[PDB]
């Protein structure tokens, strides 16, 4: 009786939101950006190849200086690379080799990683002893760690396969806030540029917008047909893009509270592993299971170019803070640095 | 390299590269095995001499100059197809089936089919274990095998009943290139390490023959 009545009210609320979104869907992003000229063909060459990982690379993250990056592989090694010289700055042996994510702190003093061990491990890069040591192991998730991002040296947000995201106080080792509401495994998260909000994509084919300070879900974005594997904020923080197993990328708007554009091709039938934006946000770069990275026109949903330099899945990618280059990690154990030429 | 500090930085990088190769060579000498099965199928005590080294439970032991790393993924209650590709480079899969549990028998059959026909385990061999065969023989007297398998029409003897269950699992394999090593074991059996070693040795030879170009 009471349960049946309540679940009917949820359907009415869902229709109310759907009608509300349809009311503000006056135009389409495709119609708005029809007049602007296309970006042309985007040609990028492999400037650097980072060799030394002996297993599948699962994650990479640039440092804020746009020169150092950290990559994680299931050879049980965290490696920090000097991308300008291809020098290895550090090699961090992981206690658990089943790593799925890695993060570089914006200060550059810490890196984080974690996987099927359900732990987010914090590593101190600047110690008086001259070696990288574990500074914190964040326990509390009951599923695998899928993504992690530093807010500062003391706070980090983690998403897990136990359907929850958490905000952690690194100094105390406790999760100050728990973000619940996803009905599937949360596979990725992206921080807003001001680090007041973050979006997460789960296996329920939905993207939720969370308030870091308040600790509740502000908005829920649906439209994908399969598990979301990747998510990335637009550079101004007013939009985000997702990548799913349905071979599509979608651009959702925070303020319009709905999808604006879909990035898919008939030839593309493989899942998407990673998404990132260029510095101006005009390009959306997505890594795919078909061993390729497709560069999309974010505004016009046109495939601008292809980065074909890997013999296995493109598992991760990232664009530097200065926008100079893009790194692609792959299951073939190599990292490549790409940019164009005049 | 031109700068004095860059030369020492390059030397540090080269020293790191050397240690990465040394670790990788020692890592490639281990036999990694993925342990799967029902919730209670005897996978916890599949080997007596093995010792543990919510998350993934890794168990390792050494048998006849070969190091085996057994990974139990039963603690991961999340979606399996989001992290099962992490074991794509596994030497073999150890699948445990309890013959004394008819309720979970059909659970194992559908679990076996997904793993056997998984897109990441096409060329991965399976070491099927049918545990509690002594309890199955004791319980086959009062409870016929037709209770769990209505289509079963063979004799109710223990030897044929156990063989029919084994043939059910091997029928799930649709790839001729995959080899399944079935074994009937008891609770008091103490040669499960030898069975794994014999099966892994056969798999290694097939891998070596591919490595030497004969295949």
């Amino acid at each position: 009786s009471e349960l049946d009545q309540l679940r009917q009210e949820a359907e009415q609320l869902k229709n109310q939101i759907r009608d509300a979104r349809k009311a503000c869907a006056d135009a389409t992003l495709s119609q708005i950006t029809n007049n602007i000229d296309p970006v042309g063909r985007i040609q990028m060459r492999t400037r650097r190849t980072l060799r030394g990982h002996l297993a599948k690379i699962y994650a990479m993250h640039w440092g804020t200086d746009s020169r150092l990056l950290v990559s994680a592989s299931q050879d049980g090694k965290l490696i920090i690379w000097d991308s300008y010289t291809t020098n290895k700055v550090h090699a961090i042996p992981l206690r658990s080799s089943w790593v799925m994510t890695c993060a570089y702190a914006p200060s550059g003093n810490y890196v984080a990683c974690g996987g099927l061990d359900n732990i987010c491990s914090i590593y101190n890069l600047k110690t008086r002893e001259g070696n990288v040591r574990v500074s914190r192991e964040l326990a509390g998730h009951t599923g695998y760690l899928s993504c992690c991002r530093f807010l500062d040296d003391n706070q980090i947000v983690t998403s897990s396969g136990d359907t929850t995201c958490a905000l952690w106080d690194i100094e105390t080792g406790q999760q100050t806030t728990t973000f619940t509401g996803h009905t599937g495994d949360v596979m990725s998260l992206s921080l807003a540029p001001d680090t007041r909000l973050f979006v997460s994509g789960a296996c329920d084919a939905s993207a939720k917008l969370w308030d870091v300070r308040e600790g509740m879900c502000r908005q829920t974005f649906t439209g994908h047909e399969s598990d979301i594997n990747a998510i990335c904020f637009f550079p101004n923080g007013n939009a985000f893009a997702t990548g799913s197993d349905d071979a599509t990328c979608r651009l959702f708007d925070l303020r319009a509270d709905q999808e604006l554009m879909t990035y898919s091709h008939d030839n593309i039938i493989c899942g998407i592993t990673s998404v990132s934006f260029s510095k101006s946000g005009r390009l959306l770069l997505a890594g795919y299971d078909d061993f390729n990275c497709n560069v999309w026109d974010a505004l016009k949903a046109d495939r601008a170019g292809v980065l074909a330099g890997h013999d296995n899945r493109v598992s991760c990618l990232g664009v530097t803070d200065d926008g100079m280059a893009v790194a692609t990690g792959s299951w073939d154990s190599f990292l490549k640095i790409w940019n164009g030429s005049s | 390299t031109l700068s004095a500090e860059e030369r020492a930085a390059l030397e540090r990088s080269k020293a790191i590269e050397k240690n990465l190769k040394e670790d990788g060579i020692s890592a490639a000498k281990d036999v990694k095995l993925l342990l799967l099965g029902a919730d209670n199928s005897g996978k916890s005590t599949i080997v007596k001499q093995m010792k543990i080294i919510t998350g993934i439970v890794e168990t390792h032991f050494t048998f006849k100059n070969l190091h085996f790393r057994l990974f139990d993924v039963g603690g991961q209650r999340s979606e399996r197809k989001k992290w099962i590709h992490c074991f794509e480079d596994v030497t073999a899969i150890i699948f445990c089936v309890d013959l004394s549990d008819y309720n979970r028998m059909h659970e194992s059959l559908m679990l076996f089919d997904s793993i056997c026909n998984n897109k990441f385990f096409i060329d991965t061999s399976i070491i099927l274990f049918l545990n509690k065969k002594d309890l199955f023989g004791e319980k086959i007297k009062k409870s016929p095998l037709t209770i769990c398998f209505p289509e079963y029409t063979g004799p109710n003897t223990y030897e044929d009943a156990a063989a029919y269950i084994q043939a059910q699992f091997e029928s799930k394999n649709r790839s001729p290139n995959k080899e399944i090593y079935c074994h009937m074991t008891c609770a008091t059996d103490t040669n499960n390490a030898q069975v794994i070693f014999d099966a892994v040795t056969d798999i290694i030879i097939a891998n070596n023959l591919r490595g030497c170009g004969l295949y």
Partner: single-chain antibody
Amino acid sequence: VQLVESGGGLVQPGGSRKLSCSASGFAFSSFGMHWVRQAPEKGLEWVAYISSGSGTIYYADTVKGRFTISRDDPKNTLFLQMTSLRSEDTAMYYCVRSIYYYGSSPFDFWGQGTTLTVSDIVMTQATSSVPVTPGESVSISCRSSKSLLHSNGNTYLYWFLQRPGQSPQLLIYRMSNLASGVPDRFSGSGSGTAFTLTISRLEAEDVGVYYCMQHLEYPLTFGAGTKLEL
């Protein structure tokens, strides 16, 4: 982090002496090691260098062929075998750790030193002494015969402070960066061959001799040193 030197003492001319540097509290095998000596009432003088992994070894010309530098990584001990000792070798010998990777701070920790008594880019610090008062801003100048700015953007100039009775401490590395544990009042500014160390709101602790060292190429050379007095 500790670096204790031993083996120094009064030796006869033409003799031999073995200096040891025991390291504790840090990953010794990860750090390159230098020997730097300081003659009594004189400035710092670099002696030798052994890299991490013992693959690269450098000597100063005044000691090359007579001194041998070696390390024992399992025992965390640094050695300096000296032969044919001359009266020019009478100095306090310091054990200095230095690690080299992108963004590292070489020469960050120095040992207490051991005293031995026997019976090239030019770095110039013309101002030998500077009278100072607490709370007032002070600038110290250093010059080099060659440009210390490399094509990679680094300017390999270092600043050290040796308080009376104490070992040198790193203040500024690569001409602008502030060493860990150093107050923000110190600031390093330079261009090409001319460099300035600015000390805003001088305090009692800042009193001492300041040395500028170049790390552009070997041999590493020190300036004469500028002393601050009240």
